[PDB]
Structures are given as structure tokens and as C-alpha cells.
Point group: C2
Chain length 301, copies 2
């Protein structure tokens, strides 16, 4: 028993992290087979970051401009190209630790593990959720660009995030591994900022189910509500709307506990309207929305 | 920027996890060089767990009674012995992925990463603090015994915890890797329960410093307090006493922020006496005590 925010074991990804240096700019890259993936902004300095033309900047580079280091061993770059906001550097050695992998793009409200790296060296691992406004609330210091986010399913690593930049509010923005940004952000210095965010309702409900499974029941009540009346309270408190597909995804948890989804929605309505009155749920005094129904099932089998 | 509960990258430990089976009991073991370490209660069934004599039970076993599996490869057991509550199984193959390691015992209030495993297969990684009552608030399902806790310092893994059992309140108890339990617990079925716990004051203060570093300042005030008057409020709210050594450990954080330790103690006193009034600190509505001063410095450089 117990319920903890848990990352995937990171070993399969640790074996893929390298350091990429271009000029005086160093950051992290992802070495899969004979290709290294990294943020394209490794090819410019701060003067270019104000208004960069990356097609121009890349044409002015050669293979020998890129230093790739996997631990001690320097990897020889034999080709370079750009795919959207990611740079692909072909190297003359296939990574012998390449896991089975896929490049997948995730949806807002889904979670993934982040392996924070500096200078190609992993430093820590933690879970993130993609917020509805396409930012993540991570922990990234200078040098962490190119750190990746991933999920693991039966020894296949699904890479979903590469870190590119920090926004003024301290949240983080990046791309999928095809180089396409999550959200309306760009890899240049503008006044860009995170848009308004909302709470992921289906995840809050999943976490209330986790709490019941772990013996927290004080917030339960005899009432039920309709989907429609619940959603009127959702909008008032800046929660995302709940759909029938959400109800269906919550099915297995509702079955394991015996509490119908719309029964739990009544509890959430009262928590939103009255607060907690000094009590806690799974050790939180706030309603937590960064656990998916899948995350809960994984720990509550 | 940002501040997140972060585990150490787990790859070095993943390469050491094996499955140990004895009869119908299977759990996790730790394979370092040519020795496998696991909880000794793998050698008994439920009838023995009520009042086991482990010296008797081990004398009745032979090497061929132990099945050790590292992935697919079965490891041949050529020796067995008991050290306190851990079983040591000598095998005929040295683990080629053995990292540099040490066996260290940690202090209450210190943190470590847990690699949750099932059937020798890692499933997730998360941070834990050793509570003052020598329990941890982990996430462990059936089959997770023998999962280990560790810290990493410059590619040396310091193993500090092996998981043995769950207590009635849902918290967890285990041993160091020499087999010596943390706290007053035993590996048999008694009515044992966690003792009263307290809040780790130095860690709460470290986390308030993290918050200031990340731009949370609303709880600061112009006041200072003495160590003695602070400690009178500590006892009232079930906080551990603060010592001069604690003040010294908080030195670097106090220097980076410009807020003297006893200045921050005044803020903690007011947070304890008045609450938060609907505000949050680093996204928590509760005061968090599972980050050490070291954990904070690691993310706030």
C-alpha cells in the first residue's frame, strides 16, 4: 500500500544521453542507433537568439563544428540536418545500448518521466504532467536543455518530450522528438508566456479513487450528481469539463472501489465548494491533478 | 528553476536487481559481485512467520532450494548464509554490471531513492525520507520485498535500505544492507506498530529556503527569534528541536538568500501559529519536511 508520485526506472534512457557542444554552447542530446537528437538552438549564441534564422545558421556549419561526447568517448559526426526544432547529427557509431523505442506525442493531462541531465550526465528523475496550456512544471537549471521525457511500456521507451526553454513564470516548454513544440512557443527570445491553465478534472477524480483504495474516505458522501450539474460547478472553479469517455476510463477504478463515477463527482463538488476543513487526502491539503487513471491503476493493483 | 522531488537516476541499481525464489515465496534480491542479498523471510511460509526460528529454518535448506533469476539467466547458488535479517546467496557468476558501491546506514531525517521492484523487475523510482520513528511512507505492493533504497555520489551507489514489511498504518519498515532493522521492528508477525512521529524541522527550513530561491516570499517577515524561543514553539507543534549544527548546515542556503536562519525561524513560527490563509509554498498548502538541506542545494545551484 501507499501512493507516491513515481517515475519510470531511467536506466534505458541514461544509456542514451550524450553531450553536444557547438562553439561555446553545450547541452544534452539523445543518442539512438547512429543519430544524436538535440535542440537546434545549440547552433546559436545569445545575439542570434533574439531573431535567428536557423536555416541560415545551419548552412554556415560543418560536421566538425559539432562535438558529441558519450562519457569519455568522442563520437565522430558525419552528417547533420534539421527537423523542425530538433537537430539530427549522424555519427559513425550506433549506440550499443539503444533500447526499443518510439517517438510519440502526448496529450495535455498525460504524464511522463523526465530525466534531468547536465553535460550529458543524468542527475535526477521525476514525473511531470503536460498542463492544459502545454507547459510543464519541471525542475531545470542552466545546462538542462535537451533532457528528455518518456514513458516505458514492456521495455519499449516512448519518448515524448525534449526540453528547450524556460518561460517567465518559471514553467517549461519543449518539443516532441520530431521537433514540434508543445503549445504556442518558439525557440527564440520573445515576450512569450504561458496561457491560462485549468485543472485536469479526470486526474483529480482518479486520485480521489487512489485515496479510497488507500483508506481515505472522509470526503465520501451519499449523494450523486448528473454529468451536467457537475460540469456547471467545474466551469465555476476553472476545472476542465468531464466527458462520457472520462467516465469510461474511470470505470475500472469505480468498479474496484464500488463508487460510481458520478458518486465521486458529488464528493469533488463538495470539496470544491467547502474546502477540506483542515483534513488531508493522501497527505495533500490540495486536490492533486497530475496522476492519470493509468498512473493510479499502476500503483493500486 | 522550479523545485521538484527528484530521485537519483536508477540505472546503476536496475542492473543489480534479481528474483529470488525459495519454495512458493518469491521476492527481490540485490546482485553485487558474486553475492545476492535479500530478506531472510524468503525462507519461510506464513505458518512460520508467526514465530520463526531463522537459524533452524536456514539449517534445513540447501543451495538447490534457492532459485535466483537475473532476467532470463538462472544464476547457480553455491553458498548461503545469514547476516542478521538479510540472506546472502553466493552465486557462481559475478554481476558484470556491479557499480562502485557502499553499504551505509542513514539517519532519521535523511532521504534516499527507492527502486520499487516486482519479481526482480524494476517498476518505478521515488524519493523517501527516513521518518524520526524509523518508518518510511513508501509505495509497496505485494512482491516488493527486497526492493532497495540508495543515494548516488559520483557514480558510487550508497545502499541504505532493503524493504521487508508493511506496518498496520500502511507505512513501511526495513533494514540496512547489513540486515539490521531501522527502528524497533522485527521480521515476524506481531502486533508491532509505528511509534509516534515528529516533523523534521531542519528540512522544513531548508524547503522554505528553496521557496525563496524559487521566488516565493509572502511568508517572510522583518522579525527574528532566538533559538530557545523558537524551540519552545517547536515542542508545542510536535517539531523536532533545532540545534546549532542545524543552523550551520543551513549556512550556505542562508548565505545564498541573505536571510539568516533565525530570521527564517520567525517565519516558520508564524506559519505554525497562523497557518497559510489560503496561500501555498512551492505548490504545497502544507509545510513539507522530506527535503534535506542537501536536496535543496542540489536543485538550487
Amino acid at each position: 500500500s501507499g501512493f507516491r508520485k513515481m517515475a519510470f526506472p531511467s536506466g534505458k534512457v541514461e544509456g542514451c544521453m550524450v553531450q553536444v557542444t557547438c562553439g561555446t554552447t553545450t547541452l544534452n542530446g539523445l543518442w539512438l542507433d547512429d543519430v544524436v537528437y538535440c535542440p537546434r538552438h545549440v547552433i546559436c549564441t545569445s545575439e542570434d537568439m533574439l531573431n535567428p534564422n536557423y536555416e541560415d545558421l545551419l548552412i554556415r556549419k560543418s560536421n566538425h563544428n559539432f562535438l558529441v561526447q558519450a562519457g569519455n568517448v568522442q563520437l565522430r559526426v558525419i552528417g547533420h540536418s534539421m527537423q523542425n526544432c530538433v537537430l539530427k547529427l549522424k555519427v559513425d557509431t550506433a549506440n550499443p545500448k539503444t533500447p526499443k523505442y518510439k517517438f510519440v506525442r502526448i496529450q495535455p493531462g498525460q504524464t511522463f518521466s523526465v530525466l534531468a541531465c547536465y553535460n550529458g550526465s543524468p542527475s535526477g528523475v521525476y514525473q511531470c504532467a503536460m498542463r492544459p496550456n502545454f507547459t510543464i512544471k519541471g525542475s531545470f537549471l542552466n545546462g538542462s536543455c535537451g533532457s528528455v521525457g518518456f514513458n516505458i511500456d514492456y521495455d519499449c521507451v516512448s519518448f515524448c518530450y525534449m526540453h528547450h526553454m524556460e518561460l517567465p513564470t518559471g514553467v517549461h516548454a519543449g518539443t516532441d522528438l520530431e521537433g514540434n513544440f508543445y503549445g504556442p512557443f518558439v525557440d527564440r527570445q520573445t515576450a512569450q508566456a504561458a496561457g491560462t491553465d485549468t485543472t485536469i478534472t479526470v486526474n483529480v477524480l482518479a486520485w480521489l479513487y487512489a485515496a479510497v483504495i488507500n483508506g481515505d474516505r472522509w470526503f465520501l458522501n451519499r449523494f450523486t450528481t448528473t454529468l451536467n450539474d457537475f460540469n456547471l460547478v467545474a466551469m465555476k472553479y476553472n476545472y476542465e469539463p468531464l466527458t462520457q469517455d472520462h467516465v469510461d476510463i474511470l470505470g475500472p477504478l469505480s468498479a474496484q472501489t464500488g463508487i460510481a463515477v458520478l458518486d465521486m463527482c458529488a464528493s469533488l463538488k463538495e470539496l470544491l465548494q467547502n474546502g477540506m476543513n483542515g483534513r488531508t487526502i493522501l497527505g495533500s491539503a490540495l486536490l492533486e491533478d497530475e496522476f492519470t487513471p493509468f498512473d493510479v491503476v499502476r500503483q493500486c493493483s
